[PDB]
Amino acid sequence: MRKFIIVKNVKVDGINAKSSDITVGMPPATTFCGLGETMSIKTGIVVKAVSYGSVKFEVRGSRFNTSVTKFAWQDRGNGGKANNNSPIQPKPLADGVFTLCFEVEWEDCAEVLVDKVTNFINTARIAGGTIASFNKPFVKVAKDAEELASVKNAMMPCYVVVDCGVEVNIFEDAVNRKLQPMVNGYKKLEKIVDNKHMRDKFTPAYLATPTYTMIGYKMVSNVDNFDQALWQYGENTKVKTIGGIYN
Amino acid sequence: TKLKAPAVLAYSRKINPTNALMFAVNWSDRDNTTAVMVGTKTVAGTQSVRGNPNDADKGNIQTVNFANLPHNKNTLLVKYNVKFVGDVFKAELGGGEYSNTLQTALENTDFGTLAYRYVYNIAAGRTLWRNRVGAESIETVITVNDQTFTFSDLLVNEFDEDVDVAEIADMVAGVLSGEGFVTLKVEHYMLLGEGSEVFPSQEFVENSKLSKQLFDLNGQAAMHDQKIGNAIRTIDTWYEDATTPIAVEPYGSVVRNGVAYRAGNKTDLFTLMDGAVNGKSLTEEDQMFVTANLIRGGVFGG
Amino acid sequence: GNAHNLISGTEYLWEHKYYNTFTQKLGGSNPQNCTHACNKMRGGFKQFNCTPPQVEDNY
DNA sequence: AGCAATTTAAATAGGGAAGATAAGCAAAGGGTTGACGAAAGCC
DNA sequence: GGCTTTCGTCAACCCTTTGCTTATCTTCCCT
Structure with missing residues (x-):
């Protein structure tokens, strides 16, 4: 028995479009x-889980x-x-209107859940971007599978992310099967011995290289x-779908 | 030390006609100006293509735009406004020095009979292209700055001497020799006949169901301004073995006859322009042809 | 960032004609202070254009 | 002061012409966005 | 003894010019 809260039309601008070194565009x-x-x-x-779809998304810049x-x-x-121009490190910016749908488990009324999610989103930041606007979030429940599809179709219109898996590597299949690559998680390289220059001194830290999976965009109703x-x-220091690989 | 023409050298049209609107009047009450509508008819016949003796009898349905005089009016009227513009050697896109040496190579061109041939082509009714074939008389009325001129019988092939064409051509050549402009409001009255068929200009349409599509201004039959201007500038009798006046072209070229009358005989415009800017003294006809091209307009470079 | 991903992806996606991409010169005006690959591949590295399809508003 | 009838059938066919052309110029700029290494005054 | 400022050091390209997907709709039934 599943419960969801959906924030539709989350207009966010100033999104850090640099998903990784080789991926710039939609946040993963x-x-x-x-x-x-x-x-x-908070x-x-x-x-x-979170199911996110893109209503609108434009990376700031040209087509190349x-x-x-x-x-x-x-x-x-x-x-x-300081009088001269500051040197530019590469960080592409983007705008995006999103639709988010959070699997939550809640035991109180839907009004305080909506108020808590609204108070979070008013202080949240999607991918480094200020949330420009968002509709009032609404709670919908997935008792059965038809009710799961009711929640699914309540995110209309948005293009959600479905995982299609890695066959050999990222570049090969992005040309061949034409799917989009994005960060499904990270790979730990070395333990970090210096916690002085970090956010926490007690949280263990690792240098990471982003692993990627290959994904497709399908409309949430399809x-x-x-x-x-x-x-x-x-639990592989990655993220994954509940339904696994989209077929 | 040859003075090469710049690639950007271009002259503008200095004889600007309007679209020749075609009305229907009688020969008596020319103020009863009723407009000739372009109608569309679809006509059955046979296909008689040169290389098709098999489709011969199968049949041929063609949708053609037609324009006719109404059966209560025997006179076609053609209304347009020629606009002779001066400042004829200042190329609006050309270089300063090449256009200046072409101007001071062509100061002594006889503008009088150039203007006479233009106003004669207006007055004899060459702007009526097929609208003159079959006509009891052709009456050309030209209003030139509050001065009405009347023209009845002028053979279009040769430029006969008369005082009214010369009178209009006096200020037309005065405009073409210097600054300013002159407007010629032309009204043609062809006594075509009761319910006779008139000939407007035809447009080119590529993927259209119409076999022939005439030029229509808000439905009214009209001639294109380029056709009228071609008929103004049909003055060239100075090419090699000239028998009829042809349109002033940079190569002396006509498309229907498939021959350029000035290509391959070093009488084309570009060779005489390079001669004018390099000290070759031009003849009077040759200067007049080059200046007629300069007031026709065109880009001459490369 | 993985260096093999950057260099091999630029070489492969220029080789396999994959033009759904962005190109970024990493070091700046003179990338030799950054990295030897940025010093030599001055044309910029190929990264994936990860823009999703848009939703047409008029429907 | 509303009442205005029902069915029935709407033409078979033959044709939609090709031949021409579809300009040549000349332009299309760079100005900032550099981090390590090394002298070298300065607390 | 670092420390902060400014000047000197070290370079060199082969580019390509839209789709990715593509929207949440009536049978039974009796009241």
């Missing part, structure tokens, strides 16, 4: 799983180059060079199983 499912665990921390409603951001002189000790669009934190 690690971003929205991070947003889900962020509310698990609001206390513990979130299993992204619009770089005019950097500001914010480091310490480079005064004197997705047969809603579990193939709900991304959640898998």
Whole structure:
């Protein structure tokens, strides 16, 4: 027995489009799983999965180059060079209207759940982008599978993410089978021995290289199983769909 | 030391006619100006294509735009406004120095009989292309700055001497020799006959069900301004072995006859322009042809 | 970021004519202070254009 | 002061012409966006 | 003894010019 809260038409601008070194565009499912665990921390409603779809999404720039951001002189000790233009590190920006659907388990009324999600989203930040606007979130429940599809079709219109898996690698199949690659998680390289320059000193830290899976965009109504669009934190330091690989 | 023509050298049209609207009047009450509508008819016949003696009898249905005089009016009226513009050697896209040396190579061109041939082509009714074939008389009325001129019988092939064409051509050549402009409001009255068929200009349409599609201004039969202007500039009797006046072209070229009368005999416009800018003294007819091209207009470069 | 992904992806997606991509010069004006691959491949690295399909508003 | 009838059938066919052309110029700029290494005054 | 400023150091390309998908609709039935 499943419960969901849907925030439709989440207009967000200033999204850090740099998903990884080789992916620029839509934020991956690690971003929205991070947003889900962020509310698990601030609001206390513990979130299993998030199904996110893109209503609108434009990467700022041309069709072959992204619009770089005019950097500001914010480091310490480079005064004197501040009159000249700051050097640009690559961070593409994008705008996106999203539709989010969080699997939550809740025991109180739907009004306080909607208010808690609204108070989170008013202080949230989708992929480094300020949430410009969002409709009032609404609670829908998936008692059975037809009710699961009711929740699924309540995200209309949006293009959700379905996992199609890795055959050999990322570049090969992106040309061959023409699917989109995105960060489904990370791979740990080395333990980090210096916790002085970090957010926490006690949380263990690892250098990571983003693993990618290959995904497709399908409209939420054309997705047969809603579990193939709900991304959640898998126990391989990755994220994964509940329904597995989309067929 | 040859003065090469710039690639960007272009002259504008300095004889600008309007679209010649075609009305129907009687020969008596020419103020009863009723407009000739283009109708559309579909006509059955046979296909008689040169290389098809098999489709010969099968049949041929064609949708053609037609325009006719109404059966209560025997006179076609053609109304348009020629606009002779001066400043004829300032190329609006050309270089300064090449157009200046072409201007000071062509200051002594006889503009008088150039203007006479233009106004004669207006007055004899060459702007009526097929609308003159079959006509008891052709009356051309030209209003030139509050001065009405009347023209009854002028053979179009040769430029006969008369005082009214010369009178209009006086200020037309005064415009073409210097600054300013002159407007010629032309009204043609062809006594075609009761219910006679008139000939407007035809448009080119590529993927259309109409076999022939005439030019229509809000449904009214009309001639294209380029056809009227071609009939203005049909003054060239100065090419090699000239028998009839042809349109002034940079190559002396006509499309229907499939021959260029000035290509391959070093009498084309570009060779005489390079001669004018390099000290070759031009003849009077040769200067007049080059200046007629300069007021026809065109880009001459490369 | 994986360096093999950047270099081999740029070489392969230029080789296999995959033009659903962005191109970014990493080091800036003079990328030799960044990285030897940024120093030599001055034309920019190929990354995937990860834009999703849009929803047409008029429907 | 509303009442206005029902069915029945709507033409078979033959044709939709090809031949021509579809300009040549000349332009299309760069200006900022550099991090390590190394002298070298300065707390 | 670092420390912060400014000047000197080290380079060199082969590019390509839209789809990715493509929207949430009536049979029984009796009241």
